[PDB]
């Protein structure tokens, strides 16, 4: 239900009428049953665990002070060694703490083997610090 990222289906329904086909409730139920038969998580014991992570400022600060043990303050470590301007510090502390908390929870898990972070920026050589 977006027109930036999709066709306007309010306009298409006005203009095409019933030439805009739609699979019905019975058909959707049949497709739902078919998809369940191929992805039967519940009868086989697959569990989906969801966490919502906010900023972890103390956790990030402890990690930064471990990264550079003899530096003075974690704000200084962020500025100098990571290369973050004074404007970007709060934003980076926000998006970095969540990423690192998720990574730590992934690693400490016993048998998960394959993580995929999805950020907005790429972590290529332009952000090597």
């Amino acid at each position: 239900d977006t027109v930036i990222h999709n066709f306007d289906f309010k306009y298409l329904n006005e203009r095409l009428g019933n030439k805009l086909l739609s699979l019905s409730r019975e058909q959707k139920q049949r497709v739902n049953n078919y998809y369940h038969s191929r992805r039967n998580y519940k009868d086989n014991g697959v569990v989906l665990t969801v966490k919502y992570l906010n900023s972890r400022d103390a956790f990030l600060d402890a990690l930064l002070e471990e990264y550079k043990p003899e530096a003075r303050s974690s704000h200084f470590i962020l500025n100098h060694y990571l290369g973050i301007a004074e404007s970007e510090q709060a934003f980076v502390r926000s998006w970095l703490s969540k990423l690192l908390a998720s990574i730590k929870a992934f690693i400490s898990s016993p048998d998960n083997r394959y993580m995929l972070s999805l950020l907005n920026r790429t972590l290529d050589t332009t952000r090597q610090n």
């Binding site: 966490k51 919502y52 003075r72 290369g83």
Partner: protein, 669 residues
């Protein structure tokens, strides 16, 4: 005693302990005064090249010598026979000079002294605070440091103030031309090294930094106090945090043998200003502008921004009616949005200085059209309040009367202010209150001889030097009052704040176990905090302890919230506290208006609750006067909240009006 200042109360040094150093007196006596510029610019550098010098400090001007600090077994040796070198005991130096020597030597006393012969900390301590990456295709950083030094005070006698100025360093390569040569003002400059752990910037002849900004005359600034989230890590990167760090470093390097104690200003009377009182003053203030016609004009060449419409919209937002016009109207209040003054090549091309001389009897105010946008482009309301209040002040000047109520000043007094056209006479203008009309004249030369006679030893502040200061003069008695900025910054209680923030950091380092929170749920059902806590525990996992970042919804305002956090602290989790409260009083000396009548000292600060980030220190102002006791009415002159924008002022209100009168006489004459 009172609020804390950068004025130094006592410098205590165990002189017999300085066993650890050898001090020599380098005397450049004998050589002629003409030979002085020939053979003194390199005297510091010739002393530096001689051997293992820690640092040197230029002595008192009448003594005409350099004090040089060396290791205990080291011996100074210069090849010049004209110079006199004698060993000097540590007790012969003035105490503050010896302290300046020892403050300089701190970086190489903390380290291993690195037996390379050219150790040098000739320039003092520079604590690195911020760094900025250079623009692309350049290496290195722009280092923003805070320098700690002692300087004798100007206004006060035989007293010295500890200073915390910002200093910027830039890489030497930035000032090198493309052909490989460095610029004119980058060659022969002292070169600095950044420490490997990144604390200090110190002198090194192999260094890569010089003490210049990236762009000429550009100013960087370190904020005074930062407590934005009670973060000790952000407190450390402020001037007061650097001062606490320096006080730690001083006793690390020298033990208890060297100590610097700051002075507390005696606290007679300290009144505070609430935002409610300021708003009450301001809403009644603007109402006097209704019964005068206000004109907005836009005389910028190539009118492009239509900022005049923005000014009109902002003015009517404060319910003041105004009209836009193509040209200024004689006899009405006029705002002329003009271009920048330098970009107009001639006076007659500038709208400013033209209608100013044309309409000699008309209130004027000017602005640039960039100065009404924020950084996101929205209208800047503070600018339009400032413009309106400046218009009100100038209208009060022209009408020779007060339009709003002002506190009663002293009776039978004349306000004199010299005007910059330096030991030659200046034009001195006067203001005076008779009945309810303000008179403004220009002082005659017959009067100014009596003023200069009665001012005694203080005549130099008014009749000598660049930027002389205005006076309040009492003609029937010959008594005077001069209001002098001492340059002494007034500090908050930085040590107690530092302890509290360290305790909060230590407390917040732990995550709260679920058992404690469930126990508080069980024990205190009447607390209103319980529902938010249950919601948070429901959202949270069942085993992992709760991080402090989840508590951010629960403030420290309600009594139940305070009881909850105090219970957590009793369980061993010091998570939140109050430091901006007036009960603690840490951020006095940055608030309200302090006024010690007995000593003649006063300062002014912000109003309301202390901001989480404070950018400036309030200076201490001193009242030089000839009274036995200063008249009580003098302190009424500071009870105005519109000379400064919604803030207490540090100059009497008759001097603002007199300044505006002098500014009006620029074009009429």
């Amino acid at each position: 005693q009172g609020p804390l200042s950068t004025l130094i109360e006592q410098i205590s040094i165990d002189t017999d302990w300085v066993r650890s150093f050898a001090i020599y007196c380098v005397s450049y006596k004998g050589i002629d005064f003409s030979e002085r510029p020939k053979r003194l610019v390199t005297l510091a550098s010739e002393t530096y090249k001689s051997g293992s010098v820690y640092c040197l400090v230029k002595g008192a001007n009448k003594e005409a010598c350099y004090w040089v600090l060396l290791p205990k077994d080291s011996k100074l040796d210069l090849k010049d026979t004209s110079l006199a070198i004698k060993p000097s005991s540590a007790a012969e130096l003035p105490t503050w000079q010896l302290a300046r020597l020892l403050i300089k030597a701190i970086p190489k006393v903390l380290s291993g002294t690195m037996p390379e012969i050219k150790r040098f900390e000739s320039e003092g301590l520079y604590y690195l605070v911020k760094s900025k990456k250079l623009p692309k295709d350049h290496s290195g950083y722009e280092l923003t440091t805070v320098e700690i030094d002692l300087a004798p005070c100007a206004a006060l006698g035989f007293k010295q103030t500890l200073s915390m100025g910002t200093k910027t360093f830039s890489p030497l390569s930035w000032f090198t031309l493309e052909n490989g040569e460095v610029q004119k003002k980058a060659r022969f400059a002292t070169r600095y090294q950044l420490d490997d752990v990144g604390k200090l910037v110190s002198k090194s002849i192999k260094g890569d930094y010089i003490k210049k900004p990236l762009y000429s005359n550009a100013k960087n600034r370190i904020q005074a106090i930062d407590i934005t989230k009670e973060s000790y890590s952000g407190f450390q990167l402020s001037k007061v945090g650097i001062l606490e760090q320096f006080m730690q470093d001083l006793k690390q390097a020298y033990g208890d043998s060297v100590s610097v104690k700051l002075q507390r200003i005696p606290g007679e009377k300290h009144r505070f200003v609430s935002d409610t009182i300021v708003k009450n003053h301001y809403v009644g203030l603007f109402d006097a502008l209704k019964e005068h016609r206000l004109v907005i004009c836009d005389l910028t060449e190539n009118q492009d921004t239509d900022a005049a419409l923005t000014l009109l919209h902002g003015i009517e937002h404060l319910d003041i009616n105004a009209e836009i016009a193509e040209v200024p109207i004689r006899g009405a209040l006029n705002i002329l949005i003009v271009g920048n003054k330098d970009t107009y090549k001639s006076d007659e091309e500038d709208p400013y200085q033209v209608y100013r001389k044309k309409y000699q009897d008309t209130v004027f105010q000017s602005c640039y059209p960039e100065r009404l946008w924020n950084r996101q482009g929205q209208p800047n309301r503070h600018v339009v309040e400032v413009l309106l209040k400046e218009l009100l002040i100038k209208l009060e000047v022209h009408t020779r009367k007060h339009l709003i109520e002002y506190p009663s000043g002293p009776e039978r007094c004349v306000y004199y202010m010299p005007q910059r056209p330096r030991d030659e006479p200046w034009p001195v203008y006067a203001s005076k209150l008779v009945g309810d009309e303000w008179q403004y004249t220009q002082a005659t030369q017959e009067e100014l001889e009596d003023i200069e006679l009665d001012l005694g030893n203080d005549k130099r502040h008014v009749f000598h030097g660049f930027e002389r200061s205005p006076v309040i003069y009492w003609p029937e008695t010959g008594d005077y009052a001069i209001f002098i900025d001492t340059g002494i910054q007034m500090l908050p209680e930085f040590e107690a704040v530092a302890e509290r923030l360290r305790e909060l950091k230590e407390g917040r380092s732990q995550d709260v176990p679920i058992a404690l929170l469930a126990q508080f749920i069980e024990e205190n059902p009447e607390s209103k905090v319980i529902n938010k806590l249950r919601a948070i525990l429901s959202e949270w996992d069942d085993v992992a302890p709760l991080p402090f970042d989840e508590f951010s919804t629960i403030a420290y305002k309600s009594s139940d919230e305070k009881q909850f956090y105090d219970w957590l602290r009793e369980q061993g989790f010091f998570l939140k506290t109050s430091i901006r409260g007036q009960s603690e009083g840490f951020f006095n000396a940055s608030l309200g208006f302090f006024y010690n009548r007995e000593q003649g000292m006063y300062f002014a600060g912000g109003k309301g609750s202390p901001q989480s980030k404070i950018e400036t220190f309030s200076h201490l102002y001193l009242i030089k006067h000839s009274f036995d006791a200063l008249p009580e009415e003098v302190e009424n002159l500071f009870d105005v909240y519109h000379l400064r924008h919604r803030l207490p002022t540090v100059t009497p209100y008759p001097f603002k009006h007199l300044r505006e009168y002098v500014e009006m006489q620029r074009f009429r004459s």
